[PDB]
Design a binder for this molecule. Structure first.
Ligand SMILES: Nc1ncnc2c1ncn2[C@H]1C[C@H](O)[C@@H](COP(=O)(O)OP(=O)(O)OP(=O)(O)O)O1
Ligand SMILES: Nc1ncnc2c1ncn2[C@H]1C[C@H](O)[C@@H](COP(=O)(O)OP(=O)(O)OP(=O)(O)O)O1
Ligand SMILES: Nc1ncnc2c1ncn2[C@H]1C[C@H](O)[C@@H](COP(=O)(O)OP(=O)(O)OP(=O)(O)O)O1
Ligand SMILES: Nc1ncnc2c1ncn2[C@H]1C[C@H](O)[C@@H](COP(=O)(O)OP(=O)(O)OP(=O)(O)O)O1
Ligand SMILES: [Mg+2]
Ligand SMILES: [Mg+2]
Ligand SMILES: [Mg+2]
Ligand SMILES: [Mg+2]
Lengths: 733, 734
């Protein structure tokens, strides 16, 4: 006898079969799901005059709550119901409108960029509509749909109104990025790229997902700024930071050049008051566009281990201490090279300098290890040069102690970053990284915010979904699509600072990584910790880099190599396979399966469109769209639970039903040796770096605390295998 | 005696107490109520075999210095002269200084003096300048003065502590530099007259001039006013500008009132403002960017209007309570208030809070047009579409005065008084802020870049007349001529690290000349602060100051031309301070004008002024000690001030305590603030800019030992009633 209120506002007799009908539709092809159980939980909440929209949200939440290890398919049941809801919210019906009608309407509403209607005719939109398969929305998991509704789908932020659906997002991201291609190949590229992303072969970053098709041109999420040892450069760096954090980009700040506390200025007219007050200025710049401390501005600051103030800099993050000697809301990357590690192993000392007192020492630190050791020993014996001496063990232990307690003191092996690099260290050294330490690019300090001679490094990101490919040879096609799409974005996006545009147009650097690596290993019956994945990893990332290079090489044939290609090691006929850490030969004997020598000559002849191509970034948000495991990291559990605005979101690792025993969870691992080996093997082929984590469970250790010896052991293990950077240290509770 | 002493060259000889007695006799000459034997008594006991002569001398200096008291103030000169003697030997190897030319030549070679001294003056001119010098004027310093000379002013090597010059060389060369470009028919005449003025303490010069002018430096700017626009580009520019100037030890005044409120839409709603406070924090780290520790270092005052939407959060930025996220403790703040705000308080009504980004024309009118402000304010109060918040005026004022009382560093600027009674036309060049110490009031324009040529940063060159050293007010004619011309020449002399600042300085050529020894000046004439007995004398005195300053700048304009932006002044349209003062001053002062202002009015109409502003009453804590003057216009807290320092305890007696101890009115001997505030208001009648006015309270003089809010608000309104533009420190006795 009860009545429901329909979406139009009309009223009608309640019909439980209609709910049953929708649930049946969503349950097609699913295993171990019960329609009746969902109905049971939903029915009790029904009242006279209840809205149909409210009825639907009731069964969505009911289905979402039933997501478990025993019945993972509820993630697709709940997802499809959610998609159904979003269709109605955006279109007033399930079936989406014609693409051209949709685009026209959205342009009039100011939600889409008008250039879509200028670059494509109505007939071309009709044709693009035939590419679209809206039923691919039925392949999302529940967590994916929530990220779509929350972050990606074009919507009204005031009212929450959803304006588009997932396949429209995909096809128009494709249409925009390839809008400047000639008409003989354009729609072919659009279809092929649309297929790649909508079938989760290629994973796109958040700013591209939410932005590309809209009037915005802000797509840079990653920025590298080098600060010079001067007030002009400090101000310039600060201004650049403010500009880019206002666009919600993460910042990597090199401040290692800033001379130490007590250093003479202009011969002695004044004396330096220390690096720390300037760090604070950088911090407030990073947090200038943030309310509260929940998220907002994020930055990593880099400095050499041998800096005179290093003992003060290492402790900047811990809770204890006064405000005067703490800069807690930034992360830090300590820059280390071979000599430092040598001093550690030999139990000798480390001498601390101010870069302003050691001519050429700072440059050699990154570019020339032989010259560094010469100058370093030269200056250690010079008594006229201001210095301080510390026990190497004491210094490393302090670093690792703060890294353990905060988890946010990072390591960068700067020699590995330049001996095994796409760049000639004598011309364009890598002297820092980004926020998450996967980016390694050249920089030049600015003497003004609009300095035309400074260089700010940017990088456009994306990732291959290793769990979505059947054969490694699929990467040829996917690399062509990924590289061409991102290279087009470089000309598409805007640059708020000249020094940033100069780097992007000069080197055209890209950073393409992977997701679902853990699922990839379980599929092939391998694991992280036992070394059984070494050869598979070697084979996999050879193919990735080869096809990326091959794609960028062919793109250079067609449109020309990047203007600053001559500054690469690639330009001199050098490949990653020539300069990798030779210690990798002891842990992987997998042969090369591709003709690198043919590629070498083709690169020498035609060059590369992009100075860099590969970088292994972390991906939490991006990964959820594919229901992929996060980047190269092992999952902490079969089911992840995340509290949020719209309730608790559950997410099951891909194909738990068949691979529950095959997965190796994070805390099921003995130590870090296996994982670090895999990272080193990856780094053999990766152009830039990898966001590698270290993990420790105190329970696995006597007295329940990780001994320093184990920390230093893993640190040296990473360096041994040519690992460039170390990101988070996760400690289990 | 078996005892031996060690001489300066390293030789040793048998101790002779007569030599100590001889030096003591020399230093004690003309001094009364000092005992040589007592100094000898305290000193001799500390002597050991082989003691250095220098250490012997430092012993008798300290002995004499410790005997500085009310019963025997002349020990301040005994100790000082002994110190001078010591500094002579340290610099010259003997008591008598070398010839001026020989001295300059040596110092230029050592790189301690600027070379342009030898390029601008011939040897004969240096010989002639040496005849001006009276090194015996070193004998007139007090002990506190000499320590300040040794500590801050005398050209020295900071590494070794070596002293290279003496006071009269400092004075004569400051004169020589500032007047170096003057024509040869008048140049050396100007040099002598200025030297006489400063060495006999008529004119008091600021620290950066005292220590700087004659050395290779060109950094002399000590106060900077920066206005921040409501944009990232301007915020960046402001930040960069701050960093540059605090690196040159300058105090900063920051106007950040334009920055829109938390939650305000950006670009129509593409983003939303995250609040003023995070930007304030960035300004703070900029101010502190060149500072180690929290002791002194970078200093700044930040300004905002009382009706700003975030005002309730801004007012509490200094107090100890709260997390670090909502506190910006290491800057001071000036709350900007006008008549309408006070009206709402008196009528017990409400005050509406706005974001300047949502109220077109309101911010501009707040400073320039009070009638238009009231029209727009009430217009926007009735508009419901416009975002706003409402608070009871009493509650808002009480919150402000609450934080002002507890911290002492929440300041008030009456912006309507700052523009209706001003040397500037508010429609063209409004005064929209002040400086660190709330005495400077100059026009500013925001920057869109650190090197923006269309922005304007306000600068001001300071100095002060010593009211205690002049015999009659007509001496100010000569002194104003010297002061104005010396400072005006400095404008062309000093460097400008930022274009927007160079524009303001060269455009308006603004000066800030004040007074010191005002309390002693009152005591000399048998007047006091609190009973109203000084009202007419103050009127007489500060009419004379402003008239002679204007007269000097007017004549300087005849000779060298008016400042490029003179047409933006009220002076240019024939308006004088005597036309626009707060009319409530007539009820507390009936002193007539003694000078021909109408003749001056016409002469300014014809020839103009070289400087847009001339007068400002700054605090003088360091500057005053050279003259042994009472600080600025402030009453002394005691007859003898005890100040602990690195070099020991410095005792300083108020001038002529011997005869005027009953004539002085010490700070805590005062009933309230009314008398003082009336004097400030009367001063402000003639002062071009503003005055660093303090409010003082003694909890002991109040029931339950707590200063009631009613008194705080009463004094606030009293200040506004008599046209007071700004309120600096609030001092609370402990
Ligand atoms: N009469 C009904 N009684 C009970 N549940 C109903 C009824 N009609 C629809 N529902 C349920 C089915 C779904 O779980 C949910 C949403 O269905 P939906 O078709 O979008 O609503 P609607 O029929 O009011 O609008 P539309 O006009 O778009 O069909 O409401
Ligand atoms: N007044 C100051 N107080 C503290 N630190 C300062 C000051 N001025 C500059 N610094 C810092 C900023 C830089 O880290 C470093 C050098 O500054 P910089 O602007 O290059 O001065 P400079 O170019 O005039 O002299 P130098 O030859 O020593 O570099 O000292
Ligand atoms: N032989 C002495 N016995 C006792 N006191 C002495 C003796 N010589 C100097 N003094 C006192 C007098 C002064 O206050 C102080 C030294 O003053 P001073 O004349 O500058 O030193 P000096 O005589 O050793 O070197 P100089 O050759 O520069 O004069 O100590
Ligand atoms: N992303 C941001 N987050 C927080 N505050 C911001 C952000 N961007 C700018 N602001 C501040 C700075 C200014 O006070 C104000 C906007 O000024 P501005 O930087 O000039 O932006 P705009 O010119 O592009 O837009 P508008 O037309 O709204 O001023 O808000
Ligand atoms: Mg229906
Ligand atoms: Mg420099
Ligand atoms: Mg002697
Ligand atoms: Mg703007």
């Amino acid at each position: 006898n009860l009545l429901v209120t329909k979406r139009d506002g009309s009223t009608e007799r309640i019909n439980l079969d209609k709910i049953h009908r929708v649930l049946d539709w969503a349950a097609e092809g699913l295993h171990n799901v019960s329609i009746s159980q969902v109905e049971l939980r939903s029915h009790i909440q029904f009242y006279d005059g209840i809205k149909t929209s409210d009825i639907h949200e009731t069964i969505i939440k009911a289905a979402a709550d039933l997501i478990s290890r025993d019945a993972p398919d509820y993630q697709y049941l709940a997802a499809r119901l959610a998609i159904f809801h979003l269709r109605k919210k955006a279109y007033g019906q399930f079936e989406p409108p014609a693409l051209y009608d949709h685009v026209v309407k959205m342009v009039e509403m100011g939600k889409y960029d008008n250039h879509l209607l200028e670059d494509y005719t109505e007939e071309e939109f009709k044709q693009m509509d035939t590419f679209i398969d809206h039923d691919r929305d039925m392949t999302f998991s529940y967590a994916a749909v929530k990220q779509l509704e929350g972050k990606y789908l074009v919507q009204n932020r005031v009212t929450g109104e959803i304006y588009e659906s997932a396949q429209f997002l995909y096809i128009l991201v494709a249409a925009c990025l390839f809008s400047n291609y000639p008409r003989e190949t354009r729609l072919q590229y659009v279809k092929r790229f649309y297929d790649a992303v909508s079938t989760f072969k290629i994973s796109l970053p958040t700013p591209i997902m939410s932005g590309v098709r809209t009037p915005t041109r802000q797509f840079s999420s990653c920025v590298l700024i080098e600060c010079g040892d001067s007030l002009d450069s400090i101000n310039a760096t600060s201004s650049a930071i403010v500009k880019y954090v206002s666009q919600r980009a993460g910042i990597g700040i090199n401040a290692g050049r800033i001379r130490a506390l007590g250093s003479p200025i202009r011969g002695g007219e004044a004396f330096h008051t220390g690096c720390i007050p300037f760090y604070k200025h950088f911090q407030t710049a990073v947090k200038s566009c943030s309310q509260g401390g929940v998220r907002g501005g994020a930055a990593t600051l880099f400095y050499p281990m041998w800096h005179l103030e290093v003992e003060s800099l290492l402790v900047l993050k811990n809770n204890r201490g006064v405000e005067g000697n703490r800069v807690r809301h930034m992360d830090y990357g300590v820059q280390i090279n071979k000599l430092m590690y040598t001093r550690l192993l030999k139990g000798e000392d480390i001498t601390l300098f101010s870069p302003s007192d050691v001519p050429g020492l700072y440059d050699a630190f990154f570019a020339d290890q032989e010259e560094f050791e010469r100058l370093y020993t030269k200056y250690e014996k010079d008594d006229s040069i201001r210095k301080q001496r510390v026990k190497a063990v004491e210094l490393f232990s302090l670093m690792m102690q703060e890294r353990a307690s905060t988890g946010r003191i990072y390591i960068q092996n700067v020699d590995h970053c330049n001996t095994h690099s796409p760049f000639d260290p004598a011309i364009a050294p890598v002297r820092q990284s980004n926020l998450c330490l996967e980016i390694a690019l050249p920089t030049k300090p600015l003497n003004d915010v609009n300095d035309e001679n400074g260089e700010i490094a940017l990088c456009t990101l994306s990732a291959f979904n290793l769990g979505a490919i059947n054969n490694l040879d699929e990467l040829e096609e996917l690399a062509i699509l990924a590289v061409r799409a991102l290279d087009a974005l470089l000309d598409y996006q805007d640059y708020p600072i000249p020094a940033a545009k100069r780097g992007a147009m000069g080197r055209r650097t890209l950073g393409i990584g992977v997701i679902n690596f853990a699922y990839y290993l379980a599929k092939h019956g391998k694991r992280y910790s036992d070394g059984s994945a070494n050869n598979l990893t070697h084979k996999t990332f050879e193919a990735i880099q080869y096809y990326l290079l091959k794609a960028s090489n062919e793109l250079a044939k067609e449109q020309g190599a990047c203007p600053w290609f001559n500054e690469t090691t690639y330009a001199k006929g050098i490949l990653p396979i020539d300069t990798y850490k030779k210690d990798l030969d002891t842990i992987a004997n997998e042969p090369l399966h591709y003709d690198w020598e043919a590629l070498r000559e083709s690169i020498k002849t035609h060059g590369l469109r992009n100075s860099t191509l590969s970088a292994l970034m972390p991906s939490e948000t991006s990964s959820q769209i594919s229901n992929a495991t996060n980047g190269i990291e092992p999952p902490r559990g079969y089911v992840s639970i995340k509290a949020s605005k719209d309730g608790i979101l559950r997410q099951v690792v891909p194909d738990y039903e068949h691979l529950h025993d095959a997965y190796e969870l994070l805390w099921e691992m003995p130590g870090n040796d296996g994982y670090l080996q895999l990272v080193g093997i990856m780094q053999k082929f990766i152009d830039q770096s990898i966001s590698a984590n270290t993990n420790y469970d105190p329970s696995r250790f006597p007295s329940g605390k990780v001994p320093m010896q184990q920390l230093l052991k893993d640190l040296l293990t990473a360096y041994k295998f040519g690992v460039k950077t170390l990101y988070y240290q996760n400690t289990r509770d």
